[PDB]
Amino acid sequence: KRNQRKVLIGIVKSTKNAKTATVQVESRFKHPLYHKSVVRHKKYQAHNEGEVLAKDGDKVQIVETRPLSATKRFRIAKIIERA
Amino acid sequence: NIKSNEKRLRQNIKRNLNNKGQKTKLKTNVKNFHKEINLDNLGNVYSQADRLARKGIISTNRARRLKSRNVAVLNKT
Amino acid sequence: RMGRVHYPTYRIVAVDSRVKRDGKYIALIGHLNPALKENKCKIDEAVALEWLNKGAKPTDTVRSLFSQTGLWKKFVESKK
Amino acid sequence: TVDLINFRNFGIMAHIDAGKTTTSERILFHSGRIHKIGETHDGESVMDWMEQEKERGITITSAATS
Amino acid sequence: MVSFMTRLNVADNTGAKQVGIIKVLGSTRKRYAFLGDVVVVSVKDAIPSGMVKKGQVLRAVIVRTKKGQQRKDGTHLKFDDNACVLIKEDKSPRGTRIFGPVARELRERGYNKILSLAVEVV
RNA sequence: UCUGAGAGUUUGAUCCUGGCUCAGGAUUAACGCUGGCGGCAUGCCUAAUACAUGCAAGUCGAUCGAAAGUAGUAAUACUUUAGAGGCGAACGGGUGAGUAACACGUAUCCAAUCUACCUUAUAAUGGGGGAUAACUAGUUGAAAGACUAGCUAAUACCGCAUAAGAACUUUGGUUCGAAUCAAAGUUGAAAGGACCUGCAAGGGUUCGUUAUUUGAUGAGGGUGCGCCAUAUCAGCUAGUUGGUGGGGUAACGGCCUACCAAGGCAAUGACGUGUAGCUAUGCUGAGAAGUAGAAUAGCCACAAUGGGACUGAGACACGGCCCAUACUCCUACGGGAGGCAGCAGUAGGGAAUUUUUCACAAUGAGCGAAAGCUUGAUGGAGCAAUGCCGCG
C-alpha cells in the first residue's frame, strides 16, 4: 500500500473557522509569451487532520486525499518551523 | 416504427412490476426493522438483501453499505 | 479498407469488443497490403501474446495470416 | 399480375354542367370501395362535400381510377 | 347574456389573452348574447405571439359564461368564466389546441370543427 | 543542414516619421470565359427552419410452446414465425446551437470508484411451484382495440434444501486516515439444450446455468497546469462557508436534510456583457509567431422545445416511454398518429455544394453452433475543373 502523495508548500493566510484554515501559495513560473517568469497566486482551504495544529504565522505543507467536504480535499500535513 | 422495441417495451413492464413488488417487500421488512430492533429480523433482511444484490435489481455495494450500517447500529449492545 | 481509393489497405488494429474503427487502440500490431496475399507484414510477435495473456479475443478474419505465422504453436499452452 | 381480359381502361367525357362533377363524383362513390379510392367507406354518411368547381377540380386532379 | 362593450378571455392557442366585445351579430337591438353567438371583438391586451394585433377589430364566437341559459334538457348548466373561440368567417378557428370546457349546444348552429379539436366537450 | 529580396505615393527640388497599394501564396469561393479526359480529394461556411416515400436494427426453430402449411394412412420428415423468452438495440451516423469551464489537453490520486460478455483458475448445475404471451369465446369497432373467462410451453419469474469462495461481525498478526493474515456469530445458487455412449441406470462432448480471482476494457470524481475579449462590467455571493447527526449515492463530497456557527471570493480583474464546441491541427512567415478550428481524428455536448421517469453492466436514450409547449397528419369526427442536426430528397433562404443511385464483394458491429442473416457502417458509380496532378 505505497501511496503517491502530492505535497505543496505554502504560507498560512488565516484561520477563520474552527479546524479550517486558509493557506496562500505563490508560484513563479515561466510565462509562455514574453519569457518572463510571472508570479501566480493560489488560496486553499483545509481542515485539521487531528494530530497537528496549523497556526497563523508559519509555513506548512499540504497533502492530497479524498474530498472531506466542499472546497476541501487536503489535510494539514506538517508545519515547518519559523525564523 | 419498430417491433422488437415494443416487445422490449412490454417485456420489462411485468419485470418492473415484480421487481418493485419485491423492493417494497424489502422496504416493509426494513421498516419493521426501523420500528424495533431484533436479531431475527436483521438476519431475514440480510438474507433478502443477499438475493437482491445477487440479482441486478439492487447494487451489491449499496446492500453491503446498508448491512454494514445496520450491524454498526445493532452492535451498540 | 483505407488509403488511396481503389487501392485497398488494412492495418491490423486492436479492439477488445466495442472499439469502432479509426479511433483509440491499445497497440498497433502492424500493417497489411491486401492486394497481393502472401502475409508479407511486420509484426511484434509479442503484442499478439499480449492479447493471449489477458483475453480480448482477436478479430476472426485476421486469423488466417496468424495461422500462416502459427500463433497456435505458441498459444496451445494457454490452458495447460 | 393477371390476364388483361379483365383489366379495362375507360373514360368519362361530358360538357361542364353536363355532369362532370355529378357523374364523376357519384361514380367514384358507387365504385371507389377499395384503398385505391376508398372514398365511399369513409364518406357514406358524412356531410355532403360539394367543393368549389375550381377547388374540387384541382383537388381531384388524377389520371387513374382503378 | 353577454354585456355590451365587455372584455372576456380566450379558450384556445391564439396568442390572445384579453379581448373585448364591440358589437354582437344578430337582429337590431338584441342587447344580449347566448351561446354560439359570434361577435365582433377588440383585443385589449395579449402576448405578442398571436397572429393579430391588440385593439384591432376581429371576429370571434363565445364559448363560456357563468350565466348560461336553460337548454332543452331541463337541467341548467353554469360556468365561472367568459371565454371565446376565434374564427375566420366560417365554422373553424386558426387555433390548434382548444382549451377549457366547451358546450354542446352549438352543433346545430355549426362550428363542428371545434368539437373534434376540443379536448373534452361538456 | 536551418537562417529575412523590393517598388510606389505629401513636395520648386530635397530629408524624418508615418499610413495606404502592388509584386507572394493560400480557400469548403461564386460567377464570367468556358472547357477533352485520367486518376485525386472535396463538395450547407448560409434558417439548431419544417418536412412524403425506400433505406438508417435486428437476431436466436440446435430454448420452447403454438397454430398453420409441402410430402406423410398414421407416426410425422420438413417448412415458418405471429409469440414467449435469450442477446443486442446506450455500439454505429451527422449536426456544433446553448456551453468561458476542471469542456478541452497534460500530469495525476482514485487510502472513493464501479464495469455483464473476454482473461488464469476455482466452486457447482438437487429439485420444487404456479401464472402468462400465443390460441379460444364474447362486449366494443372498418380498423383501433380494451375487459372478462378457459387453454399452456420455456434458460421467463417465487419459495425449500445445499454451500467451496464471498458479504456481515468478534479475537489474534500488519502501512507511510487505511491493509493483509488464522478462528468463528449471520446469510444466501441455479436449467435445461445438442450429441455420443451405455438394454437401461449412469457416464462422457459441448453451450449455457450459478459462484470466485487474476487482469484488462470501459465509465466516472478530484487534483496542479495551460487553455477568449471587455473597466463605458466595483465590489460581488448566502446550502453560500464549517463541522456534527442522519440520509442518499457504482462512489467522496451542502450531493441532500436537521442543529447551530458566520462567512466566501476580490484590484494578482472577481462578478457581469459579447462571443466560442475544445484539442490535435489547416494556412502564412526565416523563426519567434499570427490567422482559421474545412475535410479526418480524439474528448465533451445536443438531438421540434422544456421537464420527469423505467430498462439493463451500461441511457435519462437520432428512430425506448409519460406530461406540457409548438407544429404536422389521419379519422367513421368517435378519437388518435407523427418527429431527416440517419442516407438520399424536398420547401424556403442562400451567389455558393450533388444521387428522391447500387452491392453488403471484402472488412466493422449485433445475433447465431452453423446455413448465415441485418447493416446508406463500408465500399462503388452519378454531378461539379472546386483544388493538386497527369494527359489530347
UniProtKB/Swiss-Prot annotation, chain A:
GO terms for biological process: translation. Pfam families: Ribosomal_S17. Coiled coil: none annotated. GO terms for cellular component: cytosolic small ribosomal subunit. InterPro entries: NA-bd_OB-fold, Ribosomal_uS17, Ribosomal_uS17_bact/chlr, Ribosomal_uS17_CS. GO terms for molecular function: rRNA binding; structural constituent of ribosome. PROSITE patterns: RIBOSOMAL_S17. Signal peptide: none annotated. The keyword Ribonucleoprotein applies. The keyword rRNA-binding applies. Keywords: Ribonucleoprotein, Ribosomal protein, RNA-binding, rRNA-binding. PANTHER family: 40S RIBOSOMAL PROTEIN S11 FAMILY MEMBER (PTHR10744), SMALL RIBOSOMAL SUBUNIT PROTEIN US17M (PTHR10744:SF1). Part of the 30S ribosomal subunit. One of the primary rRNA binding proteins, it binds specifically to the 5'-end of 16S ribosomal RNA. Belongs to the universal ribosomal protein uS17 family. This is Small ribosomal subunit protein uS17. It comes from Mycoplasma pneumoniae (strain ATCC 29342 / M129 / Subtype 1).
Curated annotation (Swiss-Prot), chain B:
This is Small ribosomal subunit protein bS20. Pfam families: Ribosomal_S20p (PF01649). One of its GO terms (cellular component) is ribonucleoprotein complex. GO terms for biological process: translation. Gene3D superfamilies: Ribosomal protein S20. The keyword Disulfide bond does not apply. It comes from the Bacteria. The gene is rpsT. It comes from Mycoplasma pneumoniae (strain ATCC 29342 / M129 / Subtype 1) (Mycoplasmoides pneumoniae). The keyword Secreted does not apply. InterPro entries: Ribosomal_bS20 (IPR002583), Ribosomal_bS20_sf (IPR036510). Keywords: Ribonucleoprotein, Ribosomal protein, RNA-binding, rRNA-binding. Binds directly to 16S ribosomal RNA. One of its GO terms (molecular function) is rRNA binding. Belongs to the bacterial ribosomal protein bS20 family.
From Swiss-Prot, chain D:
Disulfide bonds: none annotated. It comes from the Bacteria. GTP binds at A14, H15, I16, D17, A18, G19, K20, T21. It is found in: Cytoplasm. Belongs to the TRAFAC class translation factor GTPase superfamily. Classic translation factor GTPase family. EF-G/EF-2 subfamily. Catalyzes the GTP-dependent ribosomal translocation step during translation elongation. During this step, the ribosome changes from the pre-translocational (PRE) to the post-translocational (POST) state as the newly formed A-site-bound peptidyl-tRNA and P-site-bound deacylated tRNA move to the P and E sites, respectively. Catalyzes the coordinated movement of the two tRNA molecules, the mRNA and conformational changes in the ribosome. This is Elongation factor G. It comes from Mycoplasma pneumoniae (strain ATCC 29342 / M129 / Subtype 1) (Mycoplasmoides pneumoniae). The gene is fusA. The chain holds residues 4 to 69 of 688 of the full protein.
Swiss-Prot record, chain E:
One of its GO terms (biological process) is translation. InterPro entries: Ribosomal_uL14 (IPR000218), Ribosomal_uL14_bac-type (IPR005745), Ribosomal_uL14_CS (IPR019972), Ribosomal_uL14_sf (IPR036853). Disulfide bonds: none annotated. Keywords: Ribonucleoprotein, Ribosomal protein, RNA-binding, rRNA-binding. SUPFAM superfamilies: Ribosomal protein L14. One of its GO terms (cellular component) is cytosolic large ribosomal subunit. GO terms for molecular function: large ribosomal subunit rRNA binding; structural constituent of ribosome. CDD domains: Ribosomal_uL14. Binds to 23S rRNA. Forms part of two intersubunit bridges in the 70S ribosome. Belongs to the universal ribosomal protein uL14 family. Part of the 50S ribosomal subunit. Forms a cluster with proteins L3 and L19. In the 70S ribosome, L14 and L19 interact and together make contacts with the 16S rRNA in bridges B5 and B8. This is Large ribosomal subunit protein uL14. It comes from Mycoplasma pneumoniae (strain ATCC 29342 / M129 / Subtype 1).
